[PDB]
Design a protein around this ligand. Structure first.
Ligand SMILES: OC[C@H]1O[C@H](O[C@H]2[C@H](O)[C@@H](O)[C@@H](O)O[C@@H]2CO)[C@H](O)[C@@H](O)[C@@H]1O
Ligand SMILES: [Ca+2]
Length: 135
């Protein structure tokens, strides 16, 4: 059930999980909750989501509380400003440390409590099967 888009496969779950249980599901499938690194990718994701809320790999790290991607793609603050829902992230109740895709629009992300259960999106790169590149 993996959908393909620009060198990566994506899994849109049918079962809701907490953010971390979702990530552990993705890891069990050789993947991670999805990063988003371009306008086209954001579009593909929100359109495929179709108005339902999905956990993505957005999560807080480091002492300052900076947003980051669980797949370890460096988080580009500047290029991601357009991807949040207006007025987010707002840290409602000071307990919103994970992020989801929410609105069906380029401005789509909300921060939400990590312990809430949502559907979720996994992402894994296509890696072709080739012999050892060492020698
Ligand atoms: O308006 C943006 C805001 O909406 C959500 O807050 C909900 C909450 O989840 C409900 O349980 C209930 O208390 O009503 C609220 C509407 O004000 C999101 O939780 C929040 O992160 C989001 O920013
Ligand atoms: Ca929020």
């Amino acid at each position: 059930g993996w959908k393909y888009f620009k060198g990566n496969f994506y899994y849109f779950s049918l079962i809701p999980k907490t953010w971390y249980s979702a990530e552990q599901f993705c890891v069990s499938r050789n993947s991670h909750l999805t990063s988003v690194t371009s306008e086209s990718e954001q579009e593909f994701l929100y359109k495929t989501a179709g108005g339902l809320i999905y956990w993505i790999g957005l999560t807080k790290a480091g002492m300052e509380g900076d947003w980051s991607w669980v797949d370890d793609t460096p988080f580009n603050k500047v290029q991601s400003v357009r991807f949040w829902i207006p007025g987010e992230p707002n840290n409602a109740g000071n307990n919103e440390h994970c992020g989801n895709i929410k609105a069906p629009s380029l401005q789509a992300w909300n921060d939400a409590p990590c312990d809430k259960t949502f559907l979720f999106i996994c992402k894994r790169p296509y890696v072709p099967s080739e012999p050892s590149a060492w020698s």
